[PDB]
Design a protein around this nucleic acid. Structure first.
Ligand SMILES: [Zn+2]
Ligand SMILES: [Zn+2]
Length: 67
RNA sequence: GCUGU
RNA sequence: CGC
RNA sequence: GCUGU
């Protein structure tokens, strides 16, 4: 559960659904995208409510993208 | 740099 | 979010 | 049971 696929329409500035209603990740630009399968690394601490980093390297998925 | 019960 |  | 460019 540590990888999520990025929204292509978000990446080309084009998501009419918006982050809340989109089934794909809308990550921050500082988060590294694996260009081979267009995914981002999920913050596993965040899934458990235990990420306290001021600037985390990984994606914090909204609840609708999880479990 | 986290993922393991 | 062209398979 | 359809929603996705
Ligand atoms: Zn989107
Ligand atoms: Zn985090």
């Amino acid at each position: 559960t540590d990888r999520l696929e990025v929204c292509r329409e978000y990446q080309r500035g084009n998501c009419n659904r918006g982050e809340n209603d989109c089934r794909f990740a809308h990550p921050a630009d500082s988060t590294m995208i694996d260009t081979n399968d267009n995914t981002v690394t999920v913050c596993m601490d965040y899934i458990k409510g235990r990420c306290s980093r001021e600037k985390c390297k990984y994606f914090h998925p909204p609840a609708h993208l999880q479990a």
